[PDB]
């Protein structure tokens, strides 16, 4: 039951404060996704800030 | 009180006889400088893992030696199979090497007498054992 993946939180760069949790490989650099932000109603860049838990 | 805790630890925690306590202090004066926790761990290591009883510990000057060298020589002998931990009854399959052979003898001569291993092999074990001990402290 080795923890290959970890749970990280992506914070929107639009300043709206909207954030969502996604699963990524532990042995990988910080993700920068292009996710939909409901506050501005468009796809915005997101940045990993803090690891939540190890899956 | 520093002296009081040292002797009381031997008498109460280590269950040493008052006659035996005087001999240890007379023979091994490094006990007072040694920390109580490290001293207690050193004693129980010989009593349980090694199987050495109270009278032999006092006579063999066990407590004066460094704890680290005891771990290196004993575990290497234990893994070599030359040393057998006494069972519940206290019997051993093979007579264990005498404590004087393990500790009083020099490292180079100790390997030839009992370990029957080359110098180079023992050096690698110490680095391996140190890593295991270092991980042991961090893990606990």
């Amino acid at each position: 039951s080795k923890s290959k993946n970890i749970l990280v939180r992506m914070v929107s760069e639009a300043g709206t404060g909207f954030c969502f949790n996604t699963k990524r490989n532990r042995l990988r650099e910080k993700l920068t996704l292009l996710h939909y932000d409901p506050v501005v109603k468009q796809r915005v860049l997101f940045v990993e800030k803090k690891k939540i838990r190890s899956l | 009180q520093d002296i009081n805790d040292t002797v009381r630890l031997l008498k109460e925690k280590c269950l040493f006889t008052v006659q035996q306590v005087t001999k240890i202090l007379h023979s091994c004066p490094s006990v007072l400088r040694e920390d109580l926790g490290q001293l207690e761990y050193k004693f129980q290591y010989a009593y349980f893992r090694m199987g050495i009883k109270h009278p032999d510990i006092v006579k063999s000057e066990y407590l004066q030696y460094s704890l680290t060298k005891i771990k290196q020589r004993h575990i290497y002998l234990e893994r070599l199979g030359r040393y057998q931990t006494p069972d519940k009854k206290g019997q051993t399959q093979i007579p264990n090497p005498l404590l004087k052979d393990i500790l009083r003898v020099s490292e180079a001569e100790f390997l030839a007498r009992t370990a029957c291993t080359s110098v180079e092999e023992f050096q690698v074990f110490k680095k391996l054992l140190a890593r295991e001990e270092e991980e042991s402290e961090s893990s606990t």
């Binding site: 749970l7 949790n21 996604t22 699963k23 | -």
Partner: protein, 95 residues
Amino acid sequence: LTYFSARKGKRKTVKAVIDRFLRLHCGLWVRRKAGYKKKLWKKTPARKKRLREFVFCNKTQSKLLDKMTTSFWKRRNWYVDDPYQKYHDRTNLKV
């Protein structure tokens, strides 16, 4: 359940029902879904959509919760700008 209190001699209310359920005056009980805040990262959006919604209890559960609460919780309230105000009465209901 305390059917007769030791100081007033009257029926008591179980506070574990008040903190979890909402009673519409029509008789319905509204509750949450068990697990709408637990392990949302492993649940599909369709599953989470039906978890963060309010549902109604059945006949047996509603009867059970009525016995565990006093008449103070079954009275008609007139809270100002209550989100559930329009749900307190049934419309076009037969039998």
